[PDB]
């Protein structure tokens, strides 16, 4: 009950975060962005081994869900982690799987 | 890149774990179960606000996904957290949202 009392008001938000992270290729992308100032789509396509279009869909959806944001200039678009909760969950997963 | 290198071989299992936890009522269940092994379906039903049947389906699925285990006798089935990664994620969600 203490634990439940702690977290229940935030349960739909937490579950939503976990759901948006619950795809292995989104984890790879979130891992590469974590701690990075701005990574391009082309770089993320290489690390995930997805098509460019799949990479771009993952990115467009992740931004709309509030996980990541993007910085644009005349030449390109770069992505970064927006939601610090993502970085917290990535560090835990590290501590679990290593 | 380091995060990517540590976790990438685990990303499919990591995603699966997050996906199994990515329901608000499943989070309340896992919170209630923290520290409190051997909890019955009827108590969990009462705290999720779900039907008895819906609770038991969530429980069966989380057991199948390795998150919880169960103990059964002639009278009742009781549930407890099995995967300590659950406790890790719960504790991070607490730090993030509380």
Curated annotation (Swiss-Prot), chains A, B:
UniProt GO MF annotations: DNA binding; DNA-binding transcription factor activity
PROSITE patterns per record: HTH_ARSR_2
Disulphide bridges: none
One BP term from GO: regulation of DNA-templated transcription
Induction remark: Part of the ygaVP operon, which is repressed by YgaV. The operon can be induced by tributylin (TBT), a toxic chemical used as a biocide and in textiles and wood preservation.
Disruption phenotype: Disruption of the gene affects the expression of many anaerobic and ROS-scavenging genes. The mutant shows higher H(2)O(2) levels and increased antibiotic sensitivity. Loss of the gene induces drastic changes in gene expression profiles under oxygen-limiting and/or sulfide-enriched conditions.
Annotated HTH arsR-type domain residues: 7-98
Pfam families: HTH_5
Activity regulation: In the presence of H(2)S, two cysteine residues form an intramolecular tetrasulfide bond, which attenuates the binding of YgaV to DNA. Both unmodified YgaV and sulfide-modified YgaV can probably function as either a repressor or an activator. Binds heme, which may influence the DNA-binding affinity.
Keyword annotations: Activator, DNA-binding, Repressor, Stress response, Transcription, Transcription regulation
Location of the DNA-binding region in this protein: 41-64
PANTHER family: ARSENICAL RESISTANCE OPERON REPRESSOR ARSR-RELATED
Role according to the record: Transcriptional regulator that regulates large-scale gene expression in response to sulfide. May act as a global regulator responsible for redox homeostasis. It functions as both a repressor and an activator. In the absence of sulfide compounds, it negatively regulates many anaerobic respiratory genes, including formate, fumarate, lactate, nitrate and nitrite reductase genes.
Protein name from the UniProt record: HTH-type transcriptional regulator YgaV
The organism of origin for this protein: Escherichia coli (strain K12)
Highest classification ranks of the organism: Bacteria, Pseudomonadati, Pseudomonadota, Gammaproteobacteria, Enterobacterales
Gene: ygaV
């Amino acid at each position: 009950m203490t634990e439940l009392a702690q977290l229940q008001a935030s349960a739909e938000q937490a579950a939503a975060l976990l759901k948006a992270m619950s795809h292995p290729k989104r984890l790879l992308i979130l891992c590469m962005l974590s701690g990075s100032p701005g990574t391009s789509a082309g770089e993320l396509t290489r690390i995930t081994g997805l098509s460019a279009s799949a990479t771009s869909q993952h990115l467009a959806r992740m931004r709309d869900e509030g996980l990541i944001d993007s910085q644009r200039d005349a030449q390109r678009i770069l992505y970064s982690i927006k939601n610090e909760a993502v970085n917290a969950i990535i560090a835990t997963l590290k501590n679990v799987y290593c």
